[PDB]
Design a protein around this ligand. Structure first.
Ligand SMILES: CCC(CC)CN(C[C@@H](O)[C@H](Cc1ccccc1)NC(=O)O[C@H]1CO[C@H]2OCC[C@H]21)S(=O)(=O)c1ccc(N)cc1
Lengths: 116, 116
């Protein structure tokens, strides 16, 4: 679909996310052309799963271990798509439990930004 | 135009930004559906101009005084638009010197995100 853009209403969608470490779960995610890489909440995992450490530039500065990287691919199913998006790896938010769909995922839908 | 989305290439545009506190300048700005409010580099203002304090949602944590708010409106002109975008207020980057076109401005462009 077409997603209108408004400062007052964040552009979110419901996504079924499969980390391959528990059953798939539906989350509400921010669609974000300024994010290079998708971010999913640590709440989707088991607390026995291995993650890798990572650096990331952010809007508050540069932090230590706020974000981790998944070891296995993550599959994401959108309501309007038959096929899952398969991300070889994506970021994991161990604090705020943000859910952000980034350009790695939007490229696989062939999503585009259109300014008339 | 149509702007394809790619994890490896940031969706950027050239925009002429008028802070009304110095002469207008063309800068390169990131097109960002995840930003509620447009962000302008402090370099575009005069060093005699008043800005106000405020907090901002950001990655890596919470940024008290990284970002300030403008006192006067900001006008933005795009390559394909004669008429300016008028932002009654927008964020100012006093450090990393980022330029981000947020949803306040994309709404006046009639910009949209399209997922096939
Ligand atoms: C410099 C912005 C960077 C580009 C390198 C990208 N950000 C996306 C941003 O859209 C983020 C996404 C975000 C949205 C809401 C709450 C937390 C994060 N929010 C944000 O910083 O925008 C702020 C400025 O406008 C204001 O309105 C919304 C927040 C304010 S991010 O959160 O720090 C981010 C950076 C890299 C990856 N791989 C994933 C996410």
């Amino acid at each position: 679909p077409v997603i209108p853009l408004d400062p007052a209403r964040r552009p979110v969608i419901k996504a079924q996310v499969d980390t391959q470490t528990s059953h798939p779960k539906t989350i509400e995610a921010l669609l974000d052309t300024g994010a290079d890489m998708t971010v999913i909440p640590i709440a989707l995992f088991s607390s026995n799963t291995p993650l890798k450490n990572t650096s990331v530039l952010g809007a508050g500065g540069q932090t230590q271990d706020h974000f981790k990287l998944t070891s296995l691919p993550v599959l994401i199913r959108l309501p309007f798509r038959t096929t899952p998006i398969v991300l070889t790896s994506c970021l994991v938010d161990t604090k705020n439990n943000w859910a952000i769909i980034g350009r790695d995922a939007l490229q696989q839908c062939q999503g585009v930004l259109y300014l008339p």
